[model samples]
Target: GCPPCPREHELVAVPCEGLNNCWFVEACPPC
Candidate 1:
């Protein structure tokens, strides 16, 4: 595991096909 990140928030998305489901629509975070 890695150390706890700072207060900055992050998001992740995937190619989903569900209409009712939700997913992130932004770029990936830096390593």
Candidate 2:
């Protein structure tokens, strides 16, 4: 898979609800 491009909203961290799929977040920082 390709890496995510850095955006102005450089995320330090993001919260993911339980049972929610973290695949996107795992690949993207600001996901």
Candidate 3:
């Protein structure tokens, strides 16, 4: 199972091919 993603994190949407699921991720800043 994928972890939960907060609504305040960076904009990122990763979809699972044929899995019918989309994973939201936070783009960490390196600056």
Candidate 4:
């Protein structure tokens, strides 16, 4: 099953084969 995206990361919705697609931003804070 495809899980929904998390709120912490930024997201960009894209089109894929007439289906919904999401591109999540990869931003991790320094440990």
Candidate 5:
């Protein structure tokens, strides 16, 4: 499913909640 995030940004997997739940987020890659 489509999610919120900038088109140029990449999705990253990491904890997103107080319980350490996993989720996707937008993040620019490091050069």
Candidate 6:
């Protein structure tokens, strides 16, 4: 609830079965 982006834009990718997906892939605008 603390992130400043829109709810839909806050979506990040989660790996199906790997630890490599643990990273930010999209650019979020600063509040």
Give the alpha-carbon lDDT of every model: 0.38, 0.40, 0.40, 0.36, 0.41, 0.47
TM-scores of the models, in the given order? 0.16, 0.17, 0.17, 0.20, 0.16, 0.19
Candidate closer to the true structure by lDDT (higher is better), 2 or 6:
6
List the candidate 5 regions with Cα displacement exceeding 4 Å: 1-7, 14-26, 29-31
lDDT of 5 by residue, 1-31 (tens): 2234534533455535632345443344442
| Candidates ranked, most accurate by lDDT first | 6, 5, 3, 2, 1, 4
Worst 10 residues of 1 by lDDT: 1-10
lDDT tens per residue, model 3, 1-31: 2335433433355546533345543342332
Q: What is every candidate's alpha-carbon RMSD to the true fold?
A: 8.1, 6.7, 9.1, 9.8, 7.0, 7.1
Report the error of model 4 at residue 24, Å.
4.4
Top candidate, metric TM-score: 4
lDDT of 4 by residue, 1-31 (tens): 2235534432244435544443342332232
**Deviating ranges (above 4 Å) for candidate 4:** 1-13, 23-31
Off by over 4 Å in 6: 1-11, 19-31
- Residue pairs with colliding backbones in model 2 are none
Residue lDDT tens for model 6, 1-31? 3275444444356544655445565434454
* Best-matching candidate per lDDT: 6
- Residues forming the 10-long window of minimal summed lDDT in candidate 2: 6-15
| Candidate 5 least-lDDT 10 residues | 1-10
The clash numbers for all candidates, in the given order, read 0, 0, 0, 0, 0, 0
Off by over 4 Å in 2: 1-7, 15-31
